[PDB]
Amino acid sequence: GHMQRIRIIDSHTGGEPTRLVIGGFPDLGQGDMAERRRLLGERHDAWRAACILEPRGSDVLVGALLCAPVDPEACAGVIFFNNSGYLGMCGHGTIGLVASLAHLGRIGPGVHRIETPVGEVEATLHEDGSVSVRNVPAYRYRRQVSVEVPGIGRVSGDIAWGGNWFFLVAGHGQRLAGDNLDALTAYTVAVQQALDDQDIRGEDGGAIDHIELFADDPHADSRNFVLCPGKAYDRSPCGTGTSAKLACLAADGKLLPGQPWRQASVIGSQFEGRYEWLDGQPGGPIVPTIRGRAHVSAEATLLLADDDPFAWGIRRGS
């Protein structure tokens, strides 16, 4: 043999794919997840590309690299990435990761600590196979921020953190449906770039790379559309995005602690959200818990031949 290998297990959460890498990536040291993410992106980005871009993957694909945690007492460490770069936390991805570990027979129902580049999360694998993820603290940074978006006009929304930075657009007037994707993508893409061009960032200077829209749903508290940093949309209601929404609802008294919130995605998938205050302190950031279900959909070994010009995927221009 001679081709290089990447051992993976795929799963999807409400249709949103997660490619868990359980072997094959370069050594990233012993530092914390944030430090390993730095090294991964700076010296070994080729592996992200080979893993999730064509021909072996696609732009919709989200990847998750399994790492040995710093704290030997934690269950695992993980780094999430997408078609354009790296993520902080990943809701559907953590649910997918937990479902995959269980499928691999490495864990059973229970509470599992997972270290991520933005903090440790706690995932509970239920007897029914679904997974509840107690995410890192979430909060609304700025409220009702108005932005002049080319091709759309004035748009306003909240800027909140839920494991990644999100811009929750208020009154977009768009039809959130599976048959209206091109419009929803074009709309959010315009907003995403406007925020970037006008240098509107998160509290830490981070780029607001996720744009989500919300609307009523006849069979859920709300329905949403989430544009990811690589311009692909999330098939799931997005855990960090729903966490950010929970933080906003919580700040405006629209949802009480412990109360359930059913979030449906643009294609029908559903997550159940809930929250408590960070350290029981009302009015500040919340500790959101997102519950959902993933299904393992494939186990595979990606093969990278030395003479394959696309061994590191088809990385397109611009």
Distance CA 10, CA 264 (A): 22
Is the omega angle on the peptide bond into residue 55 within 30 degrees of 0, that is, cis?
yes
Size of the chain in residues: 318
Integer angstrom CA distances of residue 203 from 89, 143, 153, 176, 195: 17, 12, 25, 29, 14
Asked whether residue 271 falls in the same domain as residue 315, the answer is no
Asked whether residue 154 falls in the same domain as residue 214, the answer is yes
Strands (E), 85-228: 110-115, 121-125, 131-134, 139-149, 153-161, 165-170, 210-217, 220-227
Judge contact between 115 and 71, C-beta under 8 A.
yes
Strands 62-67 and 76-81: antiparallel
Q: Is 90 a catalytic residue?
A: yes
Among candidate residues 13, 33, 285, 293, the one with its CA nearest the CA of residue 162:
285
Integer angstrom CA distances of residue 76 from 64, 122, 142, 204, 300: 12, 10, 33, 26, 21
Asked whether residue 12 falls in the same domain as residue 62, the answer is yes
Q: Which domain holds residue 111?
A: 1-135+293-318
Q: Can you give the resolution of this entry in Å?
A: 2.1
Judge contact between 298 and 9, C-beta under 8 A.
yes
Distance CA 32, CA 30 (A): 7
Distance CA 228, CA 190 (A): 13
Asked whether residue 150 falls in the same domain as residue 261, the answer is yes
Neighbours of 37 (CB within 10 A): 24
Judge contact between 98 and 131, C-beta under 8 A.
yes
Question: Which residue of the set 51, 90, 228, 248 is catalytic?
Answer: 90
* Residue 299 structure tokens: 């186990």
Helix-strand-coil percent breakdown of the chain, rounded to 5? Answer: 20, 40, 40
Which 3 state secondary structure label does DSSP give 58? coil
Which 3 state secondary structure label does DSSP give 114? strand
Binding-site annotation: residue ranges for substrate: 91-92, 210, 234, 239-240
Asked whether residue 303 falls in the same domain as residue 255, the answer is no
Sign of CA dihedral 115, 275, 224, 160: negative
Asked whether residue 142 falls in the same domain as residue 128, the answer is no
Judge contact between 159 and 204, C-beta under 8 A.
no
Return the CA Rg of the chain. Answer: 19
Asked whether residue 40 falls in the same domain as residue 116, the answer is yes
Binding-site annotation: residue ranges: 91-92, 210, 234, 239-240
Number of domains in the chain: 2
Integer angstrom CA distances of residue 316 from 49, 52, 64, 299, 310: 11, 13, 22, 27, 11
Name the method of structure determination. Answer: X-ray
Neighbours of 216 (CB within 10 A): 9
Sign of CA dihedral 75, 240, 314, 44: negative
Asked whether residue 251 falls in the same domain as residue 205, the answer is yes
Distance CA 315, CA 318 (A): 10
Asked whether residue 278 falls in the same domain as residue 148, the answer is yes
* Residue 202 structure tokens: 């998160």
Asked whether residue 96 falls in the same domain as residue 210, the answer is no
The string of DSSP codes covering 159-198 is: EEESSSEEEEEES-----STT-HHHHHHHHHHHHHHHHHT
Asked whether residue 298 falls in the same domain as residue 174, the answer is no
Q: Which residues, including other chains, have CB under 8 Å from residue 93's CB and lie 6 or more apart?
A: 13, 18, 62, 64, 78, 80, 87, 239
Q: Which residue has the tokens 């479902």?
A: 99
Sign of CA dihedral 78, 83, 86, 87: negative
The enclosing domain of 3 has a CATH number of 3.10.310.10
Q: 29: number of CA atoms within 13 Å, CB side?
A: 12
Q: Is 51 a catalytic residue?
A: no
Distance CA 131, CA 90 (A): 13
Asked whether residue 286 falls in the same domain as residue 239, the answer is yes
